[PDB]
Each structure stands twice: as structure tokens, then as C-alpha cells.
Design a protein around this nucleic acid. Sequence first.
DNA 1: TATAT
DNA 2: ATATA
DNA 3: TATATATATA
DNA 4: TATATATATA
Lengths: 98, 99, 98
Amino acid sequence: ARPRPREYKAGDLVFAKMKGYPHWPARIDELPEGAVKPPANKYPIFFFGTHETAFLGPKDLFPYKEYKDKFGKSNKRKGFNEGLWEIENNPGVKFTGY
Amino acid sequence: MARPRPREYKAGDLVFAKMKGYPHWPARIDELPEGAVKPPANKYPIFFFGTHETAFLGPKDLFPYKEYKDKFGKSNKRKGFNEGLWEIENNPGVKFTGY
Amino acid sequence: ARPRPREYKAGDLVFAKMKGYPHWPARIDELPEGAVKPPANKYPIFFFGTHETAFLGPKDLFPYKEYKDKFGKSNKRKGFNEGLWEIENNPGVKFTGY
DNA sequence: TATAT
DNA sequence: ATATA
DNA sequence: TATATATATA
DNA sequence: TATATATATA
């Protein structure tokens, strides 16, 4: 019913989905102008816990608060439980957008 | 006796915003989305008309638009400025997501 | 879809549901003739792991093989994981039916 | 008065 | 040449 | 090092 | 439902 966003803003907290991985606590990073532009509708993603990065479209992104109940369960994948801690307690770690 | 400028703003408010090196610039207070990294205290997300640049500014650099329009609303050759004046009058909701 | 059984036979392996507990690896025990009769359509249940007993009706009983992958997940409740072990490895423990 | 636009 | 600092 | 478990994809 | 991957335990 309620659709997920088709646009995100730097700072937004999400779960982000990559093949092979559980839906992962993540953050939309800023895209500095004066940099090479990414493909359209792809956002720079920061994964909590692992501090890995990637570019993902809205199809793979899930607003954190709305989907927390579903995706915020403990998982033994390396960095995941640390990620859950950070999205709650330190969601601005290494964030340069503001 | 002088009317103080606001110490708090709300999403949707139209202002002139001042950044060092620029004229007071037609702008809008954007919303701060729930479930985002929280901004520095007493700083608001700003949308600059004409350029569509953004920044975070506190109230000391923010000027209610209609109150300060006759002071800051003059034409200016800085790139995007006159387009900003057009937008704040004619399309102040451009790219606004607050409501 | 497929209905669950309305009657059971001594020796049948099931998950049995009691209020407050996860669906629990269990067995249909024999009903000795020459014993006080239970209420109709209630079966003597043996719970694996805890070796507790109760009388339950078919509303609360689930064929083990059919429902194993839904209910056969690890659980921290005392006796549960031992019950999972027994229903696979020693289903006839204390079984007097045959 | 000097600098950036 | 403007209009910024 | 090599087991079993848990959870990812197909 | 079956297989492959990643993780904990022996």
C-alpha cells in the first residue's frame, strides 16, 4: 500500500539491500557537486557497522523507522549488530553532509 | 526600539539567507525529515531559490522575506539571483517536500 | 489448504501448542484402556525435552514432518532444543504404546 | 581599500 | 564595473 | 581444521 | 524446496 520513497536526501536513515546480504542499517551520504555525478537515481550509501559504501537506487532502500520492526532484528553477519547500535546511537559517524 | 528577528523557523518559511561573500539571498526553510541524522542545534536546512543550492544556517543569518523584501529584494547580477527573486514570488514551493 | 488431522494415533509425532509456549516437539501417547477416560477428542501428549505431559485436542496439534520447517527452529525456552534432538533421535523415549 | 565576480 | 569583505 | 547452524539465493 | 555462503563450535 504505502509506497517507499523514490527520492532521498543526504542524512536519511534506511535499511539498504544488496544481494547476498540481509537488509542492512545504512545512511544516505551527500553527493558533493564538483564530483563525478553518479548514475541517475542512485545514491551514495554508508553501511553502519562495516562502514562499507556503495551506490543504490530507491528500489533497494527502506526508510529506517518504518521498516525497523521488520529488518532491525539481530543477525550474526559480521558488523550487523554493530550497525544496529550505530544507527541508533551514532548515526552521524563519518557523515560529511552537515 | 527594534523588532527582533525570529529565533525559530518552521518548514516552509520564506526568508533571505545570508552567507559570507553573497548578497542576502531569496531562500526557504526546508523540513528536517524525521529519521535523518539530526542537524547541529538551532540550525535549519536552507534552500536557495535560483541556484537550488542548500546549506544549514542559524537564525542570525535568516531574514523574514516580506519584512525584509524591500531591503534585500533588489536586482543583483550574481548568478541565479534574479531567477531566485522570480521563484520566491512565483514558485516558492519548488522541490519543497515538507508539505 | 490441507486440513490438519481431526484424530491421531498413539506414536504420532507432532508439534503441540500450549498457551505461553512455542509450538513444541511432542508425541501422541497411548490411551490405556482400563484408565479413566479423558474428555472427547483430547489426546495424551508427551513433550520432548521436558518430558512434561498434557491433554490436547487436534486444534493444538501439528503433524511433525509437515510442520517441521515452520516450527522446528532453535528456541531458548528450557528443554526446547533438547526436544528437537529427541524427536529426531529418540522419539520413542518413555513411549509405552508399542 | 582590496578582492571576487 | 559592481559588490563583496 | 573441520564440524554444524543459520540464512542467503535459486 | 534445495543449495551455497558465512559464522560459531568442537
